[PDB]
Amino acid sequence: DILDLEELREYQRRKRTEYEGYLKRNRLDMGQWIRYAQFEIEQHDMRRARSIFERALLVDSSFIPLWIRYIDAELKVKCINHARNLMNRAISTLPRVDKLWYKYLIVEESLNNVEIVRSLYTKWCSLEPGVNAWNSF
RNA sequence: GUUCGCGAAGUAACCCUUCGUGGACAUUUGGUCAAUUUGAAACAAUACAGAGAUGAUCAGCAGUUCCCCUGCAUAAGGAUGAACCGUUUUACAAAGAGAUUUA
Ligand SMILES: [Mg+2]
Ligand SMILES: [Mg+2]
Asked: Residue of A9, A16, A49, A74 with fewest CB within 10 Å of its CB?
């Protein structure tokens, strides 16, 4: 397959033209947005990946799996702070979803950082959430 | 250049001519733009094919697109105008069983 810069180049251009055709006709079909982001990571170019996710949110934000994978896409490259700000935008966009709060917790427990998880459960309780929040706190 | 006025000289007899001087009349055009190759019409010819739903031969309407063309057109046509017809793994768990390691 690939030889040098120039071949890699053509191999990219072709893919991007193809996909974004297929996204051009379906704004929806989230899976497509995901896969295209995934390819974008495998090219070791993040900036584009960030965007591609963001666009994918501007279409639909209620679709959590995209939130999640746009987290893990930030973590698996071992860049955290992005995966924090993203979390503030996440739970703030959707407080009623547990999966976001729990995932942001685990992100702060595997980092051992407590001060957070204290103030964190302080919020996630302050909204009078439900039985499982208190129980887990 | 005109006209009014003054002064001078000459003609003169308050004028005709010349000179000097004062005043009045008249007042800012045009460029988004330089003169064929290097700041962009689009075709044609040649070659190759030779029309979507089917097992086959065809009528068509649409639908989406950061594609348009002809048309005065919010009419209607342009192969049903064309493109589409492909690639695809994670909100992730529960229970049972054997094996490995260990407080
Ligand atoms: Mg038509
Ligand atoms: Mg059509």
From this structure: A9
